[model samples]
Target: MEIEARLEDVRQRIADVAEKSGRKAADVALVAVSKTFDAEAIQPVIDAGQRVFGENRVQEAQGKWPALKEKTSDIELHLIGPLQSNKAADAVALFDVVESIDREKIARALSEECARQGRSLRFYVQVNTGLEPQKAGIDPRETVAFVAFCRDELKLPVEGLMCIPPAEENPGPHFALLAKLAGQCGLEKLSMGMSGDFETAVEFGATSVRVGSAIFGSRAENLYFQSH
Candidate 1:
């Protein structure tokens, strides 16, 4: 029940924030990220009507989602973290959307795999707007060329741009820069934002927000191993 309530509260925030921005709650895709949490902990949120979800890794999602897919096959799964080239086909096998395509190698892997398997995925090219050395995304300078390569050369479905601002800095400028870059690419969807700063993201025109903390609470708290 706690999970349901928290999920509802997050939905309420989305509605309220969207209202202020002249967009409906449906306009902002709330991707309930269930990374590191087990299926039992994840079940309640599904019970609460969250149809879209984000998974940080492919192997874990592959382990958990099949049984849950039996429960609700309608739910959408987005790969929200870095994907390895070796895991690209496996990632393609399970995920409905790929939100971390940042380089040509993964693009080629997914592109060829999609052609082989006859399953297509909507993609969000991750842009490192903050240019953090360790982050996994296309450098902001390469975004235009990379996105064009994904769509034009590889025929990947380039849906929008995804980003994570530097932790210490204000996220507003990063959000606006992503919006500007997306415009330059003529992209339609903006899967930028998280639990902490989604309202600002909505105001700056975010079509999707990945809210794991607000929905699942802190990862440290879930470390008690609450399994069903």
Candidate 2:
């Protein structure tokens, strides 16, 4: 991919969305989803000045981080998928942010690993806004209590919330409700949206957006790895 051109277009779109929404473009962040793409493909995107990115798997991120970090000395990496308890250590080491923390077991494991590694991992409590059976996120009804448990018991930073509204859901209302919920909890970062709907996210006050296909192009295939 021509990294600069692709990123420039995304940035422009964000700006357009920001203007329409009456929000500052700078407040809307672009998180490139670099799952399954190697360091070689990511270098161009990094060179184009995108500092934040996301990965779908802990193992793949562990492998990709070294080379990717070598090129961009200050990139922030996010583990953007469900994290298993067993992979907690690697997840803490490789990712600055964990976007899909749905269960308490994984949260405890992640907290213990971060303490062991002497690294503080910032995270989002993923919510199953659409209630998809296969997805990993807290049910919206249970999210407030879940986040409270994460903050009061586990002692995790619990910075904000992230979610995937149903494909058919009205994005504006969804984003608005999410921000309101996060605000009620006193959380600051709202990591929502993607390439297709990030503009709406910005309108609804999403602090960070996880965009993959728009930035890196679609994945070649769905790659899965077992956690040890």
Candidate 3:
């Protein structure tokens, strides 16, 4: 299928699923995970009216987006990968949303950078819903306390919750759990779902869906990065 047709199809599916949950399609932002794909691949989607795009690394985005943004004035870039404390300033300077805030040190760095640069950036606490030892999120058990710390102590603008379920298990329960946790913290933004299960995520109250393969085709072998 053509890229534009594929994008419209995804949008239609999002609308259908959102409607099932009594919400408008516009309520769920579609973030085309343009991680490995470069400007050549991303421009078609942009031309098709996709303003919100996600990149996994600060360096990779830096390599291309400065030039892309010069042409397309309204793209909203999201950093949807593990963030290093050292790179917080660069991430803040380049990306509009930092979605993988998993540790206190990184949070502190982001807060300090925001203060130093005078730039306020949006953030989402990534919850390790499966408690996978290798994942990049705060433990589900400590979500509330950590969110409080980020908001009260660090004074960061922690606006939402994000998660990635165990790939071996059904994602529904994990999605439900993230939604419940978001409500417990009094946050309304739930950034869950991906290309495979975003429809399910929307039904469970996801405000944004990160889709890549479904929209951009499979990633280059070395460019495969996970999303939450």
Candidate 4:
């Protein structure tokens, strides 16, 4: 299917899911994961009216988005990968929303950069919902404390919570935990969900869903792994 057609289809599905959850579709934002896909591949989605997109790395998005944004004025880029403290300035400069903040050090870096640049970027604290040792998120038990630290101490514009469930387990529980945690933090945005189970995530109060393959096709088959 063409990108425009796929985008419409995804929007319809989101609407359907949102209705099932007794919510408005407008309440949920669709962030097309444009990671590993280049400018040409992404242009059609932009043309189709997808203003918000997710990118995994600062360097990769930097390669294409500056020029793309010159043409499309309202594009919003989100950093959806683990960010390094050293790259805080670059991440702050590039992304409109940083969704992988899990540590105090990185939070401090981003706060300082935001101050230095005189810009405030929205942030989401990533919680390792499944407690996977390899993931780049704070443990679930530490979420409330960490969120307080981010908001009160570091003075970051911490908007909400984000999480990636264990691939091998059911995502529903993890999504539920993130939603509950967001409520406890008094946050409105819950950035959960992906291609495989976004509908389920939406039902569990996901305010934003990061979908890639459903809209852009599989990353591996696209012959572009540079960003990953």
Give one digit per residue, the lDDT tens place, for model 3 in 143-175: 999999999998898889999787778999999
Q: For residues 67-172, what per-residue lDDT tens digits would candidate 1 score against the true structure? A: 8988897989999998899999899889999998877888899999999899988999999898988887898888998898888899888999999888788999
Query: Which candidate ranks first by TM-score, i.e. highest?
Result: 4
Ranking by TM-score: 4, 1, 3, 2
Clash pairs, candidate 2, are: none
Clashes of each: 0, 0, 0, 0
Q: Considering TM-score, which of the candidate structures 2 and 3 is the better prediction for this target?
A: 3
- Candidate 4 ranges with C-alpha deviation above 4 Å: 219-228
Off by over 4 Å in 2: 218-228
What is each predicted model's overall lDDT from 0 to 1? 0.89, 0.81, 0.89, 0.90
User: What's the true lDDT of residue 29 in model 2?
Assistant: 77
Question: What order do candidates take by lDDT, descending?
Answer: 4, 3, 1, 2
User: Residue 97 of candidate 3: its Cα lDDT?
Assistant: 93
lDDT of 4: 0.90
Residue 11 deviation, candidate 4, in Å? 0.6
Better by lDDT, candidate 4 or 1? 4
* Cα error of candidate 4 at position 46, Å: 0.6
Q: How many residue pairs in model 4 have overlapping backbones?
A: 0
